[PDB]
RNA sequence: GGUACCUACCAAUCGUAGCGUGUCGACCAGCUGCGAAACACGCAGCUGGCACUGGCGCUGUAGGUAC
């Protein structure tokens, strides 16, 4: 029962610096080698470092090369990636990945976790607003309406969005956010319903923001 | 430095159709290749390792083979849960090298958009800014253009596009369209709409509203 | 006078008076299997060097010893 839980992601300033932890259960982190890698938003995997066993020889990317450690503590089964120095185009989500052993999958990294956000920047941290967007009970046919919730001016990412708190899920779209000229993050998620049931029934979207610890809920309804 | 030139960067395929990727190590990384499976925000699953063992627990029709330093990976019959964006690796020396990847989209047949505007909330315009939406739901292919009008004045540079990915239950596509303006602007405009081009749209598609309507 | 042992026999070339021999092992480098193991480390096998170890076989020139 093999599991890697990475910790310690959030934002950072550039020249900042910030220590990532991967516990690992099931197995012990001395027998095998430890990786990070990372993948920054919508791009491709990047080996970043990696610690042998045995040895605990260290090796690092050249885009990382003097600026991260990587270590790892056995009276505590657990690996640690220090960053310092960090800049813009370090921002990526950080897995932890386990080297298999030599005689079953070859160098393959068999087990990976979940994965944490680390983001770089000098912008700060703010919640989002939340508003309607409300059906248009104005042209609207039967069993065709469309409703959501606008979440605007936030950063950084993430924020979740949740329709009558878990409820409602089937043909709920919640886009991916785009970066505004402002600086901050803004997306919609919105769901289509009967028309029907636009008046005898209440729609409810729970947007989060961990970051800020801005948890709203708005009703959308239709208009006057 | 290793490099691995993975091609191609992307691919539409029908189920059943066979797919092949192909991965070039810039030198000889001997047999120390592996493959990756990486869903949408989910963490890369091991494929294949030693360029050609197949990991244990993969189906069988995703085999992985060499020449020279020519690394390939197969799925004889794609599945529709094969969707996905696949991943080479070289650790052959350090420091380790990923390939590009490859996003294996699913094909399916023509879906038009079925479009929806909607006007700035009037709590967000007590704000001093006005955000108008225009949605595209349920549409094949990925292509289409969105074109804002206020007042049959073409808009440009004030707004901005984002799509989902490809829906696991019908494979279909959404856009959202927001066009951003101030308080004032807004309010001093009266017809909005929102132009829809789609491949599976005999002519454009225009939905529209007047302001306090 | 004979047999046996011992001491010495320019320089260079591992060594040797000289000829041949590259050894359990030691050292340098490489490859492979295995050790929870890409490097480092441990065990084992092999390959090429090296000649630390200066042994072994053959065979002299004298001097000496023993019989
Ligand atoms: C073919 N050749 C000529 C040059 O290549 C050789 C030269 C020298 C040797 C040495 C030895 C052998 N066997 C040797 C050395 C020391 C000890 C000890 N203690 C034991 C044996 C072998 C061959
Ligand atoms: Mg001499
Ligand atoms: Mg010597
Ligand atoms: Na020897």
């Known amino acids: 029962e093999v599991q890697l839980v990475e910790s310690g992601g959030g934002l950072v300033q550039p020249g900042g610096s910030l220590r990532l932890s991967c516990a690992a259960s099931?197995?012990?982190?001395?027998?095998?080698?430890i990786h990070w890698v990372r993948q920054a938003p919508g791009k491709g995997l990047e080996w970043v470092a990696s610690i042998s066993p045995y040895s605990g020889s260290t090796y690092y990317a050249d885009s990382v090369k003097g600026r991260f450690t990587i270590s790892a503590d056995t009276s505590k089964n657990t690996a640690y990636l220090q960053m310092n120095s960090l800049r813009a185009e370090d921002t990526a989500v950080y897995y932890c990945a386990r080297q298999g052993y030599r005689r079953r999958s070859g160098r393959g990294f068999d087990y990976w976790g979940q994965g944490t956000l680390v983001t770089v920047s000098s912008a700060s941290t703010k919640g989002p607003s939340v508003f309607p967007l409300a059906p248009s009970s104005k042209s609207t046919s039967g069993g065709t309406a469309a409703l959501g919730c606008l979440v605007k001016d936030y950063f950084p990412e993430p924020v979740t969005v949740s329709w009558n708190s878990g409820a409602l899920t089937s043909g709920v779209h919640t886009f991916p956010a785009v970066l505004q000229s402002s600086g901050l993050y803004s997306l919609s998620s919105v769901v289509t319903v009967p028309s029907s049931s636009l008046g005898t029934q209440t729609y409810i979207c729970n947007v989060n923001h961990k970051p800020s610890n801005t948890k709203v809920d708005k009703k959308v309804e239709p208009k006057s | 430095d290793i490099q691995m030139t993975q091609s191609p960067s992307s691919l539409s395929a029908s189920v059943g159709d066979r797919v092949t990727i192909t991965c070039r190590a810039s030198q000889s990384v001997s047999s120390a290749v592996a493959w990756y499976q990486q869903k949408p925000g989910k963490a890369p699953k091991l494929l294949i390792y030693?360029?050609?063992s197949l990991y244990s627990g993969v189906p069988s029709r995703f085999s992985g083979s060499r020449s020279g330093t020519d690394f390939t990976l197969t799925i004889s019959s794609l599945q529709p849960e094969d969707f996905a964006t696949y991943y080479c690796?070289?650790?052959?020396?350090?420091?380790?090298?990923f390939g590009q990847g490859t996003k294996v989209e699913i094909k399916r047949t023509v879906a038009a958009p079925s479009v929806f505007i909607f006007p700035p909330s009037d709590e967000q315009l007590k704000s001093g800014t006005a955000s108008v939406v225009c949605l595209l739901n349920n549409f094949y292919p990925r292509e289409a253009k969105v074109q804002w009008k206020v007042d049959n004045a073409l808009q440009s540079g004030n707004s901005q596009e984002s799509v989902t990915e490809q829906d696991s239950k019908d494979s279909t596509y959404s856009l959202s369209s927001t066009l951003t303006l101030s308080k004032a602007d807004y309010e001093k405009h009266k017809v909005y709409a929102c132009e829809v081009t789609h491949q599976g749209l005999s002519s454009p598609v225009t939905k529209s509203f007047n302001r306090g309507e």
């Open positions: 030693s360029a050609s």
């Open positions: 690796q070289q650790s052959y020396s350090f420091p380790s090298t």
């Open positions: 099931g197995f012990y982190i001395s027998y095998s080698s």
